[PDB]
Amino acid sequence: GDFVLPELEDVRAEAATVDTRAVLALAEGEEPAESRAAVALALWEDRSIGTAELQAAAEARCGARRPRLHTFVPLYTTNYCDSECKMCSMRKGNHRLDRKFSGRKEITEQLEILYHHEGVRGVGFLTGEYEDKHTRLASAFRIGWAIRTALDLGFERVYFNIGSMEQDEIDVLGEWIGREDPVTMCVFQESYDRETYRRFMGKTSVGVPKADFDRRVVSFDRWLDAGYRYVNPGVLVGLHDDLSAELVSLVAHGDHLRSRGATADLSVPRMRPAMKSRDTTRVGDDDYLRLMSVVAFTCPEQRLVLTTREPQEFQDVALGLAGVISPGSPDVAPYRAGCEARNDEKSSQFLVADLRRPRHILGRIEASGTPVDHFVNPAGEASR
Amino acid sequence: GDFVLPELEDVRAEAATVDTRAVLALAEGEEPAESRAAVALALWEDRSIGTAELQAAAEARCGARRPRLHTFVPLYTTNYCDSECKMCSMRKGNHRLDRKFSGRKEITEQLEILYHHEGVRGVGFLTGEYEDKHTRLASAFRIGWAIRTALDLGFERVYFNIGSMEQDEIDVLGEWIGREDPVTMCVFQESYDRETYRRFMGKTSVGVPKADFDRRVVSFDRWLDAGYRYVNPGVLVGLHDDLSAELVSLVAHGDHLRSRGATADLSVPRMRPAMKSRDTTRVGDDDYLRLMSVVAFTCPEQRLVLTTREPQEFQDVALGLAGVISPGSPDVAPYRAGCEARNDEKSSQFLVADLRRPRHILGRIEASGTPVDHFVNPAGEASR
Numbered sequence: 115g116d117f118v119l120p121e122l123e124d125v126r127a128e129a130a131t132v133d134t135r136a137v138l139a140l141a142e143g144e145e146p147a148e149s150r151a152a153v154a155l156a157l158w159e160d161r162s163i164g165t166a167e168l169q170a171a172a173e174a175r176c177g178a179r180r181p182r183l184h185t186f187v188p189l190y191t192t193n194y195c196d197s198e199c200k201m202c203s204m205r206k207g208n209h210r211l212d213r214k215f216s217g218r219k220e221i222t223e224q225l226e227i228l229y230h231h232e233g234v235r236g237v238g239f240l241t242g243e244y245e246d247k248h249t250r251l252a253s254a255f256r257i258g259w260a261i262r263t264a265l266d267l268g269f270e271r272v273y274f275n276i277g278s279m280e281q282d283e284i285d286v287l288g289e290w291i292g293r294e295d296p297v298t299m300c301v302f303q304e305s306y307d308r309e310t311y312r313r314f315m316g317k318t319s320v321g322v323p324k325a326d327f328d329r330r331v332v333s334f335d336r337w338l339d340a341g342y343r344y345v346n347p348g349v350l351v352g353l354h355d356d357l358s359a360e361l362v363s364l365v366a367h368g369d370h371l372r373s374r375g376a377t378a379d380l381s382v383p384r385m386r387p388a389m390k391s392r393d394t395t396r397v398g399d400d401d402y403l404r405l406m407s408v409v410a411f412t413c414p415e416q417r418l419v420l421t422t423r424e425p426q427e428f429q430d431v432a433l434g435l436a437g438v439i440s441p442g443s444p445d446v447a448p449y450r451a452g453c454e455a456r457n458d459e460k461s462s463q464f465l466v467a468d469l470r471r472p473r474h475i476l477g478r479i480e481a482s483g484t485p486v487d488h489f490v491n492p493a494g495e496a497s498r
Numbered sequence: 499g500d501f502v503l504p505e506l507e508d509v510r511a512e513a514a515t516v517d518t519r520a521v522l523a524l525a526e527g528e529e530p531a532e533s534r535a536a537v538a539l540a541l542w543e544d545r546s547i548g549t550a551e552l553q554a555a556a557e558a559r560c561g562a563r564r565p566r567l568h569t570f571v572p573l574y575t576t577n578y579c580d581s582e583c584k585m586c587s588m589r590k591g592n593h594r595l596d597r598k599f600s601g602r603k604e605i606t607e608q609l610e611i612l613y614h615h616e617g618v619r620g621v622g623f624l625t626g627e628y629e630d631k632h633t634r635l636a637s638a639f640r641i642g643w644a645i646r647t648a649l650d651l652g653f654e655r656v657y658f659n660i661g662s663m664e665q666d667e668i669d670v671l672g673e674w675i676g677r678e679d680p681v682t683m684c685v686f687q688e689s690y691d692r693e694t695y696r697r698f699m700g701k702t703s704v705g706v707p708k709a710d711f712d713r714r715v716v717s718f719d720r721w722l723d724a725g726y727r728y729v730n731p732g733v734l735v736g737l738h739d740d741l742s743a744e745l746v747s748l749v750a751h752g753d754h755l756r757s758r759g760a761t762a763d764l765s766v767p768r769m770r771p772a773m774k775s776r777d778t779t780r781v782g783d784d785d786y787l788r789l790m791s792v793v794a795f796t797c798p799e800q801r802l803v804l805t806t807r808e809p810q811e812f813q814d815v816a817l818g819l820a821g822v823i824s825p826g827s828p829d830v831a832p833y834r835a836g837c838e839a840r841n842d843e844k845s846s847q848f849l850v851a852d853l854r855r856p857r858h859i860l861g862r863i864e865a866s867g868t869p870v871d872h873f874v875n876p877a878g879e880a881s882r
């Protein structure tokens with residue numbers, strides 16, 4: 115009953131039977147006759163439907179969803195990692211990185227800055243992924259504490275992204291939270307193509323924890339087995355050259371999670387500069403918007419996540435396709451009251467394109483006419 | 499200003515000038531003219547002073563100390579370890595051990611059992627020692643949380659024994675506590691002889707963390723540098739064949755710590771059965787009592803720690819030389835209300851000789867006429 119990757123040849127055959135114009139004519143809250151993955155593929159490949167027209171249709175099909183947007187800010191709690199992903203600066207073989215680790219004091223200080231100075235009520239905790247069982251359990255323990263601590267401070271939504279998770283590691287993290295707490299597990303498969311995955315994440319059976327594709331991809335099934343609800347699959351756009359394959363796999367994974375009763379966000383982060391050991395594929399804005407549009411349209415209750423990997427000009431264009439906006443920096447403990455967050459090449463996972471403070475980014479979204487849930491702008495009579 | 503091991507040849511020469519009978523005639527609170535280590539050696543080697551007579555003298559020289567005894571119970575929070583000590587079942591190469599790790603729930607439950615059912619107000623937290631910096635920091639983090647949690651529950655004294663500690667690892671643990679909290683760092687050198695140490699703890703530069711003798715031995719100096727106070731050196735009796743060498747080194751280490759203003763307990767645990775990879779030296783009761791007597795006498799403000807490594811019959815004989823009594827089991831989360839603690843060969847560090855419940859052991863000490871501080875016998879109107 116775990117997720118099984120779809121057979122692309124089978125999806126292609128079903129995609130051939132989809133009437134894409136009829137699909138576009140569907141009322142909001144109406145579901146196509148064919149599978150979501152087949153419809154996504156059919157919309158993707160039918161180039162008589164313009165990308166801008168697909169994006170307009172996606173924004174309308176999602177237009178009823180409330181809240182329109184919510185936010186969380188990432189907080190990297192360490193940049194140690196045992197794995198070796200060739201597109202990521204945190205890879206263990208990158209001896210140039212200055213490695214850092216946040217203790218109790220620093221984690222708490224960062225959460226207070228985010229809460230009081232940035233006005234945010236969503237946070238995400240990130241770590242590397244570790245090889246030996248004891249380290250994995252001790253990481254789960256510390257992140258469980260961070261989650262409980264953020265909820266107790268008044269954060270209303272907590273994400274975590276700490277690697278694949280086995281049953282006993284979920285047990286350790288879970289002793290910190292309740293089954294109905296607003297806690298989302300993030301595990302981005304990066305590529306659902308096993309060969310591209312191996313190229314970037316490494317080979318198995320050699321002490322490289324994220325090289326195990328199968329352990330990673332069933333992490334959400336373990337989380338749902340344990341009685342939790344919120345999950346966040348993702349694809350790293352720019353690893354695999356064939357985007358049609360990845361959108362089929364992601365939509366199929368979302369559909370599986372939906373059928374198990376999960377609430378899923380969907381992440382499609384695009385590559386950013388990093389201290390890489392292998393080059394990646396640059397995906398143009400039209401393809402990327404078409405991918406976002408097709409996923410958002412076929413998965414209208416699963417919010418796309420948009421992040422400050424993208425520059426301000428792209429956020430302007432794409433924000434209507436998103437249901438989560440996540441501004442922040444992938445450096446360890448980077449926030450400081452009144453100051454721009456750090457994004458030091460010597461310690462960050464990658465370089466972001468937008469370094470403006472979260473409360474400025476989110477305040478400008480609100481001023482342009484979209485409320486952001488889990489954002490309390492620290493102004494006026496809410497100004498301290 | 500770190501501890502420097504004494505030159506045994508130099509101590510021997512000073513020991514030759516000690517008048518051991520005059521030393522015995524010293525009033526309590528009077529200090530011999532020669533160094534503590536030289537006097538200890540001189541008492542050890544002067545076989546015209548009987549061991550029983552040395553033990554009587556030691557008990558009298560310490561007789562004024564208050565409280566006469568205090569207690570703590572060990573709580574092993576995991577039996578994972580990266581090191582390879584050949585006398586220890588937890589060594590990483592022991593593939594027979596069932597490896598266990600206590601999360602938040604289990605640690606808290608164990609502390610509540612110890613507090614309410616055993617009546618104890620001292621606890622010690624133990625782990626393995628880990629190789630990579632991230633694991634060491636995450637272990638320090640979790641043990642710091644355990645220490646804070648025990649203090650908040652009303653434990654009045656907390657020991658920890660989690661391996662050598664570098665400055666940044668002490669920083670992480672330290673964010674959990676205050677500089678004047680009743681927290682004792684334990685780091686038993688095991689043998690102060692570098693060659694015996696290498697034989698059992700392994701060779702350096704190969705991923706075996708406790709093989710670094712120097713990192714280990716200056717851990718207390720780092721702890722004092724950070725502004726803490728309480729420390730607990732130790733020798734594992736039965737590693738090195740020449741006990742006179744080890745008592746000189748231990749007494750010299752205690753004297754150094756005293757000169758830095760520390761409060762030091764001294765541990766001389768004797769070997770117990772384990773899943774070993776090298777045999778050890780059995781030390782008879784007369785030599786062991788003579789060693790305890792000479793250390794207790796020359797170091798009258800530094801409490802010897804006696805544990806349930808020893809059988810009831812030996813505790814009866816030696817308890818007068820101790821200032822700390824520590825009953826318990828070296829298995830992970832072994833305590834259960836109303837039941838004997840577990841000491842499973844499949845998961846414990848070694849097999850103890852006395853498996854009676856701490857409150858029985860400590861209640862019998864109290865009934866025989868020695869109060870035990872940090873023990874509240876759960877009886878009568880203190881019975882719940």
Ligand SMILES: C[C@H]1O[C@@H](n2cnc3c(N)ncnc32)[C@H](O)[C@@H]1O
Binds near residue numbers: 275348349385388464
């Ligand atoms: C936390 C997420 O960040 C993504 N990720 C990893 N490396 C990079 C990069 N150079 N640029 C952008 N995103 C990256 C992965 O999808 C990872 O899961």
Ligand SMILES: C[C@H]1O[C@@H](n2cnc3c(N)ncnc32)[C@H](O)[C@@H]1O
Binds near residue numbers: 587
């Ligand atoms: C926690 C302490 O237990 C001691 N130690 C390690 N192995 C054994 C054994 N087989 N028997 C008794 N004590 C042991 C070490 O001195 C270690 O530092």
Ligand SMILES: NCCc1c[nH]c2ccccc12
Binds near residue numbers: 238441444
């Ligand atoms: N979800 C991946 C981490 C993240 C969320 N928001 C971000 C902004 C910038 C960099 C990473 C993130």
Ligand SMILES: NCCc1c[nH]c2ccccc12
Binds near residue numbers: 622765806807826828
């Ligand atoms: N101080 C070493 C751990 C310890 C304290 N008391 C014990 C009793 C039995 C075994 C270990 C201990």
Ligand code: MET
Binds near residue numbers: 204241276
């Ligand atoms: C910092 S990257 C995300 C978390 C984890 N290291 C992983 O790659 O799954």
Ligand code: MET
Binds near residue numbers: 624625659662686708
């Ligand atoms: C469990 S043995 C004591 C703690 C640590 N593993 C060390 O040997 O120092």
Ligand code: SF4
Binds near residue numbers: 197199204206241243
């Ligand atoms: S993507 Fe995550 S697991 Fe891979 S190297 Fe980076 S931090 Fe480590």
Ligand code: SF4
Binds near residue numbers: 627
């Ligand atoms: S004595 Fe401590 S470091 Fe050595 S193998 Fe045992 S638990 Fe590990």
Ligand SMILES: [Br-]
Binds near residue numbers: 180181182183485
């Ligand atoms: Br809204």
Ligand SMILES: [Br-]
Binds near residue numbers: 385386387388
């Ligand atoms: Br790039």
Ligand SMILES: [Br-]
Binds near residue numbers: 270487489490
């Ligand atoms: Br809110």
Ligand SMILES: [Br-]
Binds near residue numbers: 566
């Ligand atoms: Br007393």
Ligand SMILES: [Br-]
Binds near residue numbers: 771
């Ligand atoms: Br033995």
Ligand SMILES: [Br-]
Binds near residue numbers: 619872874
């Ligand atoms: Br007490």
Ligand SMILES: [Cl-]
Binds near residue numbers: 348382383419421
């Ligand atoms: Cl994302």
Ligand SMILES: [Cl-]
Binds near residue numbers: 803805
């Ligand atoms: Cl001891």
